């Protein structure tokens, strides 16, 4: 093995914007990596393809992965409704860090966020599992469609996604 | 992120003295920073403007923020009457440090202090959230109107305050 | 201390259905009873008048009190965005029990539930604070519009509310 890489082709109201790719740190958090990889390829029959980023806060992060209700209340893991925080080995070191959204301890589902800054205050309460490899400039362009309270002003979607290697 | 900057325009017995400005460490304690920022702009309909520094102790600190009772017993946060200790990442490293006053754990309101000395004995029990950028000379002038017990010899007021950046 | 009593006048797609009244156990959880009383009078500028029951599950409970988002994601208390679990003195003893919804420890806001059975699996994790006095029949009627998943076949409304004594 190497650490796996996934891609998101991002669209804005259906117009393609670009690709973001991610290293998933399966050498630190194999279970959390695998969940995201699997949901990215679609191979369990559900996943991120077609889903939207429902909450984007410029200067902070882009939040997505809610493929069942597209508003933050939804999604599911390949392990069931929720799974445990695997460990907190990795920290929120800076822009591009990919980390799990949750609703408290041991509530990992499918939602994730992509950081557009060092978010240190989240260390120890969100499992960090990957980092943006190429396409930070695309995450930066996605930002511009966000707002302070998170509402997006255009529909930002994962038009396709899957694994590169 | 870019850390916000707020300013206070300090008056002594109604006479404008000058400007103090502060960096807020939104990148370490965003919720604490945001409270001070918004109380400083006035944007929720209440806040620091017109309030006084009720307790000044030479060699220690200047304490204010008590915009409802003007004596240490009052104030409220933008989040409700009180909020939790966000974290203790930042320490009380020297003069200029901005930190929350409290009444024990998890009782952050609107009250704060501006250190005029390193105050290491408060680390771990006051959330530090900013630092003087400019106008430390104003804080030193303020400090002279305090006393061992904190009673002030002139009314030290925040005539106006707000966000620069 | 005599315990206060509030009323809900319930409506189904706007068709008046009837009055439910509630004893609030201010003698056990005064802070939690007061939140609900004030929301019920609307005296603080906001409250339950006009809100709906967004999740109703026959044989379990009716959940309402989300007056900002009407889906379980919203509501606020009179003490701010959230407040602490006051105590767990009272248990979920049977139908009619009024208890608080939450998103885990110390996340009480405006959401509540009216039990329709004994729900003892919740003792300790939801602050019980009141109980149906008159109108249990009106709740058993509301119960009929829910479903195993909680979605309601009609808009169950609090057309009016306030305090009797």
């Amino acid at each position: 093995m190497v650490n796996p890489t996934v891609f998101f082709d991002i669209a804005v109201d259906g117009e393609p914007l670009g690709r973001v790719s991610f290293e998933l740190f399966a050498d630190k958090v194999p279970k959390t990596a695998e969940n995201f990889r699997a949901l990215s390829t679609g191979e369990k029959g559900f996943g991120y393809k077609g889903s939207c980023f429902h909450r984007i806060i410029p200067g902070f992060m882009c939040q997505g992965g809610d493929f069942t209700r597209h508003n933050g209340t939804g999604g599911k893991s390949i392990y069931g409704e929720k799974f445990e925080d695997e460990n907190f080995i990795l920290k929120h070191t800076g822009p591009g860090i990919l980390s799990m959204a949750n609703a408290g301890p041991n509530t990992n589902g499918s939602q994730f966020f992509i950081c557009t800054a060092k978010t240190e205050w989240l260390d120890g309460k969100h499992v960090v599992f990957g980092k943006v490899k190429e396409g930070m400039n695309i995450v930066e362009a996605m930002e511009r469609f966000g707002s302070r309270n998170g509402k997006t002003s255009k529909k930002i979607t994962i038009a396709d996604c899957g694994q590169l290697e | 992120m870019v850390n916000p900057t707020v300013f206070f325009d300090i008056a002594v017995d109604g006479e404008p003295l000058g400007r103090v400005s502060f960096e807020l460490f939104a990148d370490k304690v965003p919720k604490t920073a945001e409270n001070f920022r918004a109380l400083s702009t006035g944007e929720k309909g209440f806040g620091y403007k017109g309030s006084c520094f009720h307790r000044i102790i030479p060699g220690f600190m200047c304490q204010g923020g008590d915009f409802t009772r003007h004596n240490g017993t009052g104030g409220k946060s933008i989040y409700g009457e009180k909020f939790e200790d966000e974290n203790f990442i930042l320490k009380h490293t020297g003069p200029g440090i901005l930190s929350m006053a409290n009444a024990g754990p998890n009782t952050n309101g609107s009250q704060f202090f501006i250190c005029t000395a390193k105050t290491e004995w408060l680390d771990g029990k006051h959330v530090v959230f900013g630092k003087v950028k400019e106008g430390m000379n104003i804080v030193e002038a303020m400090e002279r109107f305090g006393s061992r017990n904190g009673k002030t010899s002139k009314k030290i007021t925040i005539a106006d305050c707000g966000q620069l950046e | 201390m005599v315990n206060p009593t509030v009323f809900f006048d319930i409506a189904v797609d706007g068709e008046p259905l009837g009055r439910v009244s509630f004893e609030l156990f201010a003698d056990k959880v005064p802070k939690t009873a007061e939140n609900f009383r004030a929301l019920s009078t609307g005296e603080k500028g906001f409250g339950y008048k006009g809100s709906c029951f967004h999740r109703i599950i026959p044989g379990f409970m009716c959940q309402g009190g989300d007056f900002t988002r009407h889906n379980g994601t919203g509501g606020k208390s009179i003490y701010g965005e959230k407040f602490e679990d006051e105590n767990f003195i009272l248990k979920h003893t049977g139908p009619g029990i009024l208890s608080m919804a939450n998103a885990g420890p110390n996340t009480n806001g405006s959401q509540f539930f009216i039990c329709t059975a004994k729900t003892e699996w919740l003792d300790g994790k939801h602050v019980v604070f009141g109980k149906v006095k008159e109108g249990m029949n009106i709740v058993e009627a509301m119960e009929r519009f829910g479903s195993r998943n909680g979605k309601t076949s009609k808009k169950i409304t609090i057309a009016d509310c306030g305090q009797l004594e």
Binding site: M61, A103, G104, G109, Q111 | P30, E86 | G72, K82
Partner: peptide, 11 residues
């Protein structure tokens, strides 16, 4: 504030 939750978004 600036949290990343799923359901109850807090300040």
């Amino acid at each position: 504030x600036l949290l990343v939750t799923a359901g109850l978004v807090l300040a």
